[PDB]
Amino acid sequence: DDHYELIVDGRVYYICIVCKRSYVCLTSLRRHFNIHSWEKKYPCRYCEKVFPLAEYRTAHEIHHTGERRYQCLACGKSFINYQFMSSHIKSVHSQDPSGDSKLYRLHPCRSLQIRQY
DNA sequence: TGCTTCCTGCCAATAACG
DNA sequence: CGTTATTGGCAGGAAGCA
Ligand SMILES: [Cl-]
Ligand SMILES: [Zn+2]
Ligand SMILES: [Zn+2]
Ligand SMILES: [Zn+2]
């Protein structure tokens, strides 16, 4: 028992009973709620750190391996995450990768095992 | 104030369950 | 083994940090 529902204008919101954060879908509330309950743990496999979300652990573990998955297509430089890539493309190439063009390539993750696309 | 990490709608990949 | 439920990768804006 971790939420209540709030309905405004026919739109359904799921509210965390602990911190009152609002979610459009229940899956997100359940993913969020682990921060409170710590029902599941996500331990780094390279150090002692433990995370409340699987994706937080993954981003952290990529830091351990040093893999650079985000590649700028304008000059070929590669980056650890979206933020480094975006900062680069905006500052050096004066372009926005969230725009209407494909300015970067996200390589598959090869330095560790996560599900592929 | 420029890195560092967090956050959540969306949904493909994966697991659970008969 | 077909049907259903769950996980968690991803973008890219937000929040944290020193
Ligand atoms: Cl690499
Ligand atoms: Zn909460
Ligand atoms: Zn670690
Ligand atoms: Zn570049």
Side-chain angles (χ1 to χ4, degrees), chain A residues 2 15-21 23 29 32-33 35-36:
Chain A
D2 54 353
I15 313 301
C16 175
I17 195 44
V18 173
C19 73
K20 269 66 179 180
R21 275 180 159 88
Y23 298 89
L29 183 17
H32 158 76
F33 198 82
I35 294 172
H36 304 314

Side-chain angles (χ1 to χ4, degrees), chain A residues 7-108:
Chain A
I7 306 182
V8 184
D9 299 357
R11 269 171 297 267
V12 181
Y13 301 99
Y14 306 94
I15 313 301
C16 175
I17 195 44
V18 173
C19 73
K20 269 66 179 180
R21 275 180 159 88
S22 174
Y23 298 89
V24 163
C25 56
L26 200 57
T27 56
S28 289
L29 183 17
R30 298 277 154 81
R31 171 175 59 186
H32 158 76
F33 198 82
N34 201 48
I35 294 172
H36 304 314
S37 63
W38 279 99
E39 164 196 43
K40 297 189 180 298
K41 301 90 180 185
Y42 302 95
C44 180
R45 270 138 307 181
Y46 305 88
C47 77
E48 70 295 327
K49 283 186 185 168
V50 184
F51 301 84
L53 266 74
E55 73 178 37
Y56 296 175
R57 172 174 65 180
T58 295
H60 172 79
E61 294 192 329
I62 288 289
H63 266 282
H64 277 289
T65 70
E67 185 177 6
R68 279 158 171 79
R69 296 178 61 202
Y70 288 84
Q71 186 171 25
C72 172
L73 296 182
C75 72
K77 291 192 181 193
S78 309
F79 305 93
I80 290 164
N81 58 34
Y82 184 103
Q83 291 75 25
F84 284 128
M85 172 279 299
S86 188
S87 290
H88 165 80
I89 293 191
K90 290 181 173 181
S91 64
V92 176
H93 303 297
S94 186
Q95 288 176 267
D96 175 26
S98 70
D100 302 333
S101 299
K102 287 308 175 297
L103 302 182
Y104 74 99
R105 181 159 51 167
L106 178 56
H107 295 288

